[PDB]
Amino acid sequence: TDKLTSLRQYTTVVADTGDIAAMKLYQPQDATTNPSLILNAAQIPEYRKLIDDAVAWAKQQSNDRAQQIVDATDKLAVNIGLEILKLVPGRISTQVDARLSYDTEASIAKAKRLIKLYNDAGISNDRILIKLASTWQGIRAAEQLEKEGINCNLTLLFSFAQARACAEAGVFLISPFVGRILDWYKANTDKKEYAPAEDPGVVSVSEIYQYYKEHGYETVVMGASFRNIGEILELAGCDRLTIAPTLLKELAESEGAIERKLSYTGEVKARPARITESEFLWQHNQDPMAVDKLAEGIRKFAIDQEKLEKMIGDLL
Amino acid sequence: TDKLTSLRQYTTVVADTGDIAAMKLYQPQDATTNPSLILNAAQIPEYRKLIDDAVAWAKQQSNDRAQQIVDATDKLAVNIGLEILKLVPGRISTQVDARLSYDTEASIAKAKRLIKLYNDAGISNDRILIKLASTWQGIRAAEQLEKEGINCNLTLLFSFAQARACAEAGVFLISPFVGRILDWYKANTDKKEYAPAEDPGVVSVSEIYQYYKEHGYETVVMGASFRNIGEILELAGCDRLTIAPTLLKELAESEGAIERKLSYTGEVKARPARITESEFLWQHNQDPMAVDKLAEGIRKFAIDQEKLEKMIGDLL
Secondary structure (H helix, E strand, O other): OEHHHHHOOOOEEEEEOOOHHHHHHHOOOEEEOOHHHHHHHOOOHHHHHHHHHHHHHHHHHOOOHHHHHHHHHHHHHHHHHHHHHOOOOOOEEEEOOHHHOOOHHHHHHHHHHHHHHHHHOOOOHHHEEEEEEOOHHHHHHHHHHHHOOOOEEEEEEOOHHHHHHHHHOOOOEEEEEOHHHHHHHHHHOOOOOOOHHHOHHHHHHHHHHHHHHHOOOOOEEEEEOOOOHHHHHHOOOOOEEEEOHHHHHHHHOOEOOOOOOOOOOOOOOOOOOOOOHHHHHHHHHOOHHHHHHHHHHHHHHHHHHHHHHHHHHOOO | OEHHHHHOOOOEEEEEOOOHHHHHHHOOOEEEOOHHHHHHHOOOHHHHHHHHHHHHHHHHHOOOHHHHHHHHHHHHHHHHHHHHHOOOOOOEEEEOOHHHOOOHHHHHHHHHHHHHHHHHOOOOHHHEEEEEEOOHHHHHHHHHHHHOOOOEEEEEEOOHHHHHHHHHHOOOEEEEEOHHHHHHHHHHOOOOOOOHHHOHHHHHHHHHHHHHHHOOOOOEEEEEOOOOHHHHHHOOOOOEEEEOHHHHHHHHHOEOOOOOOOOOOOOOOOOOOOOOHHHHHHHHHOOHHHHHHHHHHHHHHHHHHHHHHHHHHOOO
16 A cells, blocks of 8 residues: 555644645645645635635724734634634644744734634634744743643744754644755755755754653654655654645555654653753854744745735725 | 045044054054954964963963863953054954853853953053944843943844844944855855945945934944955945955055045934834844844854864963
């Protein structure tokens, strides 16, 4: 049989898309969306109903243009999540406005607003992950949210400083990126081709996995962002992997059994003192890839948010 | 006559070097050093005496190897500053350990330690600038130091966020970079050749100068880091410009009068509310050049500090 089935022996497969068609085809446990995937899904003709409901809902909440734009964009993202939850038994990830990524208080408020919208639609917190960029401010936001029963997905995770800080904050889940790390190394070193085991994204996730398991951290490790199935197969055994439909299709179409690659068998090791903000900043900025790609990811997600607001603004 | 003389009609010329030979030759008003220039100057044979005095001094302060390394490196930097002050009537800039760039309290303590060493050598605070990287933490350190009578030189200034935050903190001087901005644009865009007026470093400083003067800010604007004399001449009129001996030589050797380029003639405009930390972080990270080059500059200055410690450690 096939590599997707074989991978599922070792790893919980999660679908990276806002498209319900993929949920029906691959039957993933969880799904992840982000502002870019929301923007994309808002282009699907059968999703027109959801956009219209969002706008109609926003118009019931206030007579203010600016607030309606915000309400409508939020309710759209939640509506898409609601449709996905009908077809997946686990979590939906919904990302907060990336423009809030360096503001802890605002991120906490936006997360709670998204959670309220889900709760009012009849969905409990154990079905939701709020996605936040893994800046110091987002990690601090997540730490508080978890204490209030709101589970988070810490995204745009590139540096070891980020990984360490997330574990220490007790966040429910992290999405350490793989493919964007590969992108950076191709652009910034002479080495353009990598064996799967040498892929710097694969190395990143493998080392984060080891660090979490060896210190008994319960934060779910979920690899995200993939350029090819070689990366995915090298991470077989990762707690979860969120994978785009294109690569789910390649896995399902690929014959052959695979082996588990990521395991930890040893003792639980003593934890260090918590990393301080200053230490975090020093160590994150030691990593030029991480410096670039965290900042870039946030810029790109904010641009897509702005495009979503323009679309919604055109319909008011 | 010559372009250096002509430039001096409009701008206070400062020498960017730890080499006393340049102070004798060009007779600058101020001088700037940095950890890289200290490392370089420590290679000058006639500076052996200064290294030996630093080590001898460090050995008088403690019997501890680690502390002697720190005391000796600090005293060397100050000794080089002391020799420069014999030949320049204005300021010396001396940079704190770049490893402290994201730690406000440690940066304040290091600045005061450097100030003490100068004061004990008979030099008053009005002859010194403590250089700090213009991270939020360094700007906050500077704000406090200025209130305590310690004047600062905010370096590695790339983004408007940094410029704005520095002005609002009331720092004595900023060093907005020119040449490293050009470097980033040549590396990351297809455009490899720039007319002086189009040079992005020149544009950066020009826009910072306009902002400072139009809001009545009294922080000294000092362009730093140059790749060519075209950059320098486009900034004629900048309060100060710190220039490396190689480019001082080219100016002195170039015949012809130059015009003033940077002036502000209009009304003082109302200031905004102070930029918050979250707004600063957002706006700094909107600037991919600034994101990369601030983090990089700090890494490079920390590496040179380490190399300095290795040399000193070899002599204990």
